[PDB]
């Protein structure tokens, strides 16, 4: 068996963590054991009446199957008449864009840590079938001991044999805006801006408008500024690839060991990267 099923009237809940349009995420406090928790609410009503179903059910079906310390745990789940509750692991340091404001830029060591966590994540996560098709900054959490913790699944992919989504525009693949379809190598594109946005500041991509955004990403049209750790281009031209199949850690290019082999991560050790302590962020 297991524990019973929990309730809400198990829990004191607090502030909220963040909205969307499908759910409210709180902050709770489990009475029986004090344990924090970040409680995802949905209104049952508003996600049959939106179709909704088949994007919850695969959400928490994502995350059951997720056994990694880069990614948030669901603990449990419950509802009662008119909410469904998941119970997930609360990472107190929140969006990882906070940090990229705060201090406006990250170091070569601080970008090389917290890229070879994402990486890493990335690994695991297709190693699943499994693709996130909505990785950025404000996904990408933090725990209380700074290590990331990736988040929101509501937009995941499972793989079987990947078009009805799109993403946030600033992180939109070219293949998504042509070919209307998605694999992994959507991600490794999300990662390529990510990469770029933490040395650089700012996302890749930027314009007025989507429409003008989406014009730049199909033309490739973008630059580094001057300052820009060489190694940490030369990844990121190689991630930010038009072809999807020419993309640096894609399975056409051969997976995960060349990616993690690039000059950039010289220093890495992949094997324990959760037991070595962040640098300090500035």
């Known amino acids: 068996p297991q524990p ?20 409210t995420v709180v902050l709770a406090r489990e009475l029986a ?12 009503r508003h996600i049959i009446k939106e179709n909704k179903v088949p994007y919850v059910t695969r959400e928490r079906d994502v995350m059951s199957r997720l056994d990694h310390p880069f990614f948030v745990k669901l603990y449990f789940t419950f509802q009662d008449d008119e909410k469904l509750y998941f119970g997930l692991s609360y990472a107190k340091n929140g969006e990882l864009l906070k940090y990229i404001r705060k ?5 070569e060591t601080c970008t090389r840590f917290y890229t070879a966590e994402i990486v890493s994540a990335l690994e695991y996560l297709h ?14 959490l933090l725990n209380e001991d700074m290590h990331i913790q990736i988040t929101d699944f509501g937009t995941a992919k499972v793989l079987s044999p990947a078009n009805s989504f799109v993403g946030t525009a600033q992180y939109v ?12 190598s959507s991600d490794l594109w ?10 650089a500041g700012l996302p890749p991509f930027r314009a007025g408008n989507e429409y003008l955004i989406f014009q730049k990403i199909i033309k490739l049209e973008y630059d580094f500024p001057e300052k820009f750790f ?6 990121v031209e190689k991630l930010l690839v038009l072809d999807a199949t020419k993309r640096l850690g894609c399975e056409e290019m051969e997976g995960y060991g060349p990616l993690k082999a690039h000059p950039f991560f010289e220093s890495v050790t992949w094997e324990n990267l959760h037991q ?7």
């Not at 019973?4 to 499908?22: A, M, N, Q, T």
């Open 103 to 107: 201090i406006g830029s990250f170091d």
């Open 230 to 235: 060489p190694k940490a281009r030369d990844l």
């Open 276 to 282: 070595q302590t962040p640098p300090k962020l500035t």
């Open 4 to 23: 019973r099923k929990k309730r809400p009237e198990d829990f004191k809940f607090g502030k909220i963590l963040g909205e969307g349009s499908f759910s």
């Open 190 to 199: 999300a990662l390529g801006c990510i990469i770029y946005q933490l040395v």
């Open 127 to 140: 190693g699943k079938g499994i693709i996130h098709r909505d990785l950025k900054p404000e996904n990408i």
């Open 173 to 184: 693949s070219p293949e998504l805006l042509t070919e209307k379809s998605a694999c992994k």
């Open 33 to 44: 054991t004090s344990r924090e928790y970040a409680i995802k609410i949905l209104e049952k």
